[PDB]
Write a protein that binds this DNA or RNA. Structure first.
Ligand SMILES: Nc1ncnc2c1ncn2[C@H]1C[C@H](O)[C@@H](COP(=O)(O)OP(=O)(O)OP(=O)(O)O)O1
Ligand SMILES: [Ca+2]
Ligand SMILES: [Ca+2]
Ligand SMILES: [Fe+3]
Length: 1103
DNA sequence: TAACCGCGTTC
DNA sequence: TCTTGAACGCGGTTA
């Protein structure tokens, strides 16, 4: 009888909705026809849909429905409710007796079943479905979702009893109605998702809510303007510890409402009363802040809640407020006798996040984590602000925040205000357009669209297409607890992914010549291919015709000439062209080209290859069962082995099968790779393929607008500062949008391996990867015969080409326009489209007679960027090994184009190494010769080497603690690391012993540590000191370092005598080895930093 | 030496 | 409850 709690919540929410301007609107009745063409004549109210939530109504037992929250055209708001019977299907293993099952379930489920009906859907796993045969199903409908769940608990025993055997009757011997029910289907669709899909309603669109239903008003283009508030709180904190919502108070709540800044203060903690000030960190971000200097903390909370209730916001934005700000305000409200739910309608939900019915909570940190495409080291609000808004917000050390309420109150008021400015404007410029536009195609509310994984987002879009094509949803995938290969227990199985090669290291600049040896037969091939490749660049790449171009021969003659000149002199020493070629939407286009989709893996048969890789124990079956019977006889946490769960059973089996295999085979795990083939039907209902093609086209629009505005900008004179400032803003705006669509797009590839995937196919994912590896290696084979490829990753190639190699040309058409042509790009694309096009792609031409056509499909194109000014690739310390996924590339104007992989970019590495790498990549541009180039990097190296060889005596204390520090995050809590050794685990354990157990209470703690010299010759994980120790009082300090260095002798407590300076001298040393010296050796110049000795294998090679 | 792990990247 | 994939670098431990 849980409807009590549910019907109550609906009443409470209904009243909270009314207080915030959302009273349930019921449209006037209409007896005329229901056509969208006469929208202006049908009685009703038009609004912009801003939110939606499942609810229970009481005949206006509970009745399932969805509240839809609207903003109307006349500055007001309202909500409307649609009711819809929840439902799922019953499948039968013989469609001749469906009416018998129908009579069974009508009586078996009569306690909760509302109505019943036989319907037909298309089953993609059913024979003859491509000819029109459909699966017959029983549609069970219910009054509310509680009744649906009851029928599930009632049907599950039947489904489990039919999968078990039968019973002991006359052993000397038409089937029961219960054994005919094969499975239940579409039983786990969220209700409001079910309503959103079935009724074709989306947040962000305009509707007219009439008696017949919602009529989309396609005349209304732009989004309505909700009132948006972003807030940030600041609280007191113990020195070197974390805020505790029990003890610590809230100093101030800064916020902003549609541009107007505000600030509530807690005069009981903030010493002064602050006057109205301004923070406009850039002209485009005004920030006039009105302050509410209040007395008590209760006064502060009550003004915040009162201000919320009066402005009536439908969007409240925060930065990580879901797991700090909101629970802090809620805990302070409870302590102070204020129920936050009665006040503002917010409350925690099942995941601990804070939501409301009328107002979406947009935690910008969720957007940053999923869609911003920033590295984790740049996901703090400070880095996000300078990357996305283009300015540096106000900083100050958090250790000084609790004191500065008393000492420098105005400065700390400026910080809290800058956080509110950065949060509000990042939401309005980035989070708000993206998520609300996303809601128009994904059947979720803004809160869910922001937070769900990209795989779940893909699943939502796929369920819309499947439903609209009457395709039965597959049930969620389930992986078996045990799988075997050749009798061996499998520990993990997967496929071979992308192909990555590190081919050359060192420095390559457009002003420094390189030596090329051009394969003459390679130029022979491109000459034979040149006529049809230029036609390909004209007709396929630029979608034109050779008839309308006027310099086809002139450009063909210009390329053949250069082609021929480079064939005669195949040995050259010229300046290079630093180029990058990269397939646009590689895996998506590989899928759509070959018609890849889970339901297509089974002449409509396209056989494509993939590579399965398995990891299994060396033990065979004879030893498996031996360990099992052993584990069976032992006791467990009062319980037997067979009385455990199958999961806990295999847990113990795996633990004891690792120990055995180690002591008998010397190994614990064997890996093997087998080439597998799969049949890809080229006629299957392409609802999956088409969904990918649609979203890829969606992303392509923003990707092309970024390229346009990168062109509009360079065509603007450097003097027009305002024009070029606005062009650069659209550039970062469209780059952000296309990057936000990139992860969702590629999750269509990843979704086929996601746990619980409705369309799981390991085969399809492997085929995509192997096909990509085959294309990118064919491209390398041509580049290595024409130039020198430097690095290669999955679908991209960094290479240098002779300056004499044919480069960029522009066709001219009789219109007067121009067609762009990059010959290094089109020469590869022509080969792409000669060796990899799918000539077996089929589509329904006549659906009524089920006749198909067969056409040729290939949307795989390399895209080129460059030529660049410099590329700097590091080398490995070990002989012959390269360094993949790490380099630096610079533009012609000297700016950094790409910085990939290096510690400078990663979250929390050795800070000294970050500043070193930061100071050094710029200087690889200096110098006039390659040897002179390496001397400029040598000087900055020797500067950093000097700081360490001097034991940091040439830096002030605070710069030293900043420099030698290393920060590392612990993804889990310490207790989850039992049995493991690490510098983070040590730092966290020592932080807990000195600062208290509550320091490790939560996951994600940043362990900032220093590595001590003593105890000597001890493992490095034992000498990691929390840097917090040196800010504690001298008694508390000394006791712990004496403890941690095992030196009761010790009282020279200064950092410079504790640090293992030789350790950091090695860390910097190998950094200098990999970036500077070892690549310099591989380019043939003597060690530019002789204070960093070469490897023994490298010295021997120099002989 | 080589297998192995956690973190965080590049695709 | 939720829940895209694999390849890779590096500091560190372990067999
Ligand atoms: N985040 C991801 N999740 C799943 N697969 C990914 C992800 N990122 C990259 N991949 C895979 C699929 C991509 O097609 C393939 C090539 O990477 P990349 O070239 O960076 O993306 P892309 O080719 O789709 O975009 P672009 O058009 O910008 O090159 O790597
Ligand atoms: Ca803050
Ligand atoms: Ca790509
Ligand atoms: Fe087929």
């Amino acid at each position: 009888a849980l409807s009590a709690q549910q019907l109550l919540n609906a009443s409470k929410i209904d009243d909270i909705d009314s207080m915030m301007g959302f009273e349930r609107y019921v449209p006037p009745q209409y007896n005329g026809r229901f056509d969208a063409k006469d929208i202006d004549q049908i009685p009703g109210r038009v609004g912009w849909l801003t939110n939606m939530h499942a609810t229970l109504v009481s005949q206006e037992q509970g009745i399932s429905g969805v509240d839809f929250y609207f903003l109307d055209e006349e500055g007001g708001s309202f909500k409307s409710t649609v009711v819809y019977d929840p439902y799922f299907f019953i499948a039968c293993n013989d469609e001749s007796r469906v009416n018998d099952v129908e009579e069974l379930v009508k009586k078996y489920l009569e306690s909760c079943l509302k109505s019943l009906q036989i319907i037909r859907k298309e089953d993609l796993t059913m024979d003859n479905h491509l000819l029109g045969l459909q699966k017959t199903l029983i549609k069970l409908s219910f009054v509310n979702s509680n009744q649906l769940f009851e029928a599930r608990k009632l049907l599950r025993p039947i489904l489990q009893d039919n999968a078990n055997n039968n019973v002991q009757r006359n052993i000397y011997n038409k089937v029961d109605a219960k054994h005919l029910i094969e499975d239940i289907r579409e039983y786990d669709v969220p209700y409001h998702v079910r309503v959103s899909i079935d009724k074709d309603i989306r947040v962000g669109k305009w509707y007219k809510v009439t008696q017949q239903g919602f009529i989309e008003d396609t005349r209304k283009i732009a989004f309505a303007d909700p009132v948006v508030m972003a807030f940030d709180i600041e609280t007191t904190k113990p020195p070197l510890k974390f805020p505790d919502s029990a003890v610590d108070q809230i100093m101030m709540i800064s916020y902003m409402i549609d541009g107007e800044g505000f600030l509530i203060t807690n005069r009981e903690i903030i010493s002064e009363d602050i006057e109205d000030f301004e923070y406009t960190p850039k002209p485009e971000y005004p920030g006039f802040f009105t302050i509410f200097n209040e007395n008590d903390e209760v006064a502060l909370l009550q003004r915040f809640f009162e201000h919320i209730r009066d402005v009536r916001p439908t969007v409240i934005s925060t930065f990580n407020g879901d797991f700090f700000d909101w629970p802090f305000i809620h805990n302070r409200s409870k302590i102070h006798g204020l129920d936050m739910f009665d006040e503002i309608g917010f409350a925690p939900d099942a995941e601990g996040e804070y939501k409301s019915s009328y107002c979406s909570h947009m935690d910008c940190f969720r957007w940053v984590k999923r869609d911003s495409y920033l590295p984790q080291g740049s996901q703090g609000l400070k880095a996000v602000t300078q990357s996305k808004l283009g300015y540096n917000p106000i900083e100050l050390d958090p250790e000084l925040m609790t004191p500065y309420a008393f000492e420098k109150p105005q400065h700390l008021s400026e910080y809290s205000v800058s956080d509110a400015v950065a949060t509000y404007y990042l939401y309005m410029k980035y989070v708000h357009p993206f998520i609300f536009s996303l809601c128009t195609i994904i059947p979720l509310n803004p809160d869910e669209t922001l937070r769900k994984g990209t795989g779940t987002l893909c699943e939502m879009l796929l369920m819309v297409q499947a439903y609209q094509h009457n395709i039965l949803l597959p049930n969620k995938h389930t992986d078996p607890i045990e799988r075997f290969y050749d009798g061996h227990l499998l520990e993990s199985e997967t496929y071979v992914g992308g192909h990555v090669e590190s081919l050359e290291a060192g420095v390559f600049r457009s002003d420094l010549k390189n030596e090329f040896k051009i394969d003459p037969s390679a130029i022979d091939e491109l000459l034979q291919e040149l006529p049809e490749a230029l036609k390909f660049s004209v007709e396929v790449e630029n979608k034109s015709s050779v008839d309308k171009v006027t310099n086809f021969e002139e450009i063909k003659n210009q390329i053949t000439q250069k082609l021929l000149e480079l064939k005669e002199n195949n040995i050259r020493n010229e300046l290079p062209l630093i180029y990058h070629v990269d397939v646009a939407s590689g895996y998506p286009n590989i899928m759509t080209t070959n018609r890849l989709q889970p339901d297509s893996i089974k002449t409509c048969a396209r056989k494509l290859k993939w590579a399965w890789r398995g990891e299994f124990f060396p033990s065979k079956m004879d030893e498996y069962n031996m360990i099992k019977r052993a584990l069976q006889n032992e006791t467990f946490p009062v319980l037997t082995f067979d009385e455990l769960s199958y999961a806990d059973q295999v847990i113990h089996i795996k633990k004891r099968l690792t120990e055995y295999s180690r002591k008998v085979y010397h190994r614990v795990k064997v890996s093997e790779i087998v080439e597998r083939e799969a049949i890809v039907c080229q006629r299957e209902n392409p609802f999956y393929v088409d969904t990918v093609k649609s979203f890829r086209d969606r992303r392509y629009e923003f990707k092309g607008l970024a390229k346009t505005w990168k062109g509009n900008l360079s065509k603007i004179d450097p003097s027009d500062k305002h024009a070029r400032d606005e062009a650069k803003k659209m550039i970062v705006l469209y780059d952000s949008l296309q990057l936000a669509h990139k992860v969702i797009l590629n999750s269509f590839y990843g979704y086929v391996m996601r746990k619980g995937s409705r369309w799981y196919s390991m085969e399809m994912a492997g085929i995509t990867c192997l096909t990509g590896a085959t294309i990118i290696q064919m491209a390398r084979a041509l580049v290595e015969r024409v130039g020198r490829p430097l690095e290669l990753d999955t679908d991209g190639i960094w290479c240098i080409l002779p300056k004499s190699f044919p480069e960029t040309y522009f066709f001219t058409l009789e219109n007067g326009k121009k067609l762009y042509l990059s010959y290094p790009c089109s020469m590869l694309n022509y080969r792409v489209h000669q060796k990899f096009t799918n000539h077996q792609y089929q589509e329904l031409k006549d659906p009524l007679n089920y006749i198909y056509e067969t056409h040729s499909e290939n949307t795989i194109f390399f895209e080129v960027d460059g030529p660049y000014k410099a590329m700097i690739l590091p080398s490995s310390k070990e002989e012959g090994k390269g360094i993949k996924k790490r380099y630096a590339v610079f533009n012609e104007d000297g700016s950094l184009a790409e910085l990939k992989g290096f510690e400078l970019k990663r979250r929390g590495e050795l800070q000294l190494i970050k500043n070193f790498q930061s100071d050094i990549f710029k200087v690889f541009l200096e110098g006039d010769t390659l040897e002179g180039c390496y001397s400029a990097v040598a000087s900055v190296c020797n500067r950093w080497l000097d700081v360490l060889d001097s034991h940091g005596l040439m830096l002030e204390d605070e710069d030293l603690v900043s420099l030698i520090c290393e920060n590392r995050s612990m993804s889990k809590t310490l207790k989850e690391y039992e049995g493991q050794k690490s510098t983070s685990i040590t730092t966290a354990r020592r932080l807990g012993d000195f600062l208290g157990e509550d320091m490790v209470k939560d996951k994600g703690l940043q362990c900032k540590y220093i590595i001590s010299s003593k105890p000597f010759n001890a493992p490095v994980t034992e000498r990691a000191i929390p840097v917090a120790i040196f800010s504690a009082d001298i008694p508390i300090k000394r006791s712990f370092l004496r403890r941690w260095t095992l030196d009761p002798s010790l009282e020279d407590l200064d950092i410079r005598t504790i640090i293992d300076w030789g350790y950091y001298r090695e860390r910097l040393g190998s950094a200098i080895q990999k970036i500077i010296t070892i690549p310099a050796a591989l380019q043939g110049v003597s060690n530019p930093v002789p204070r960093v000795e070469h490897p023994d294998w490298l010295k021997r090679k120099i002989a």
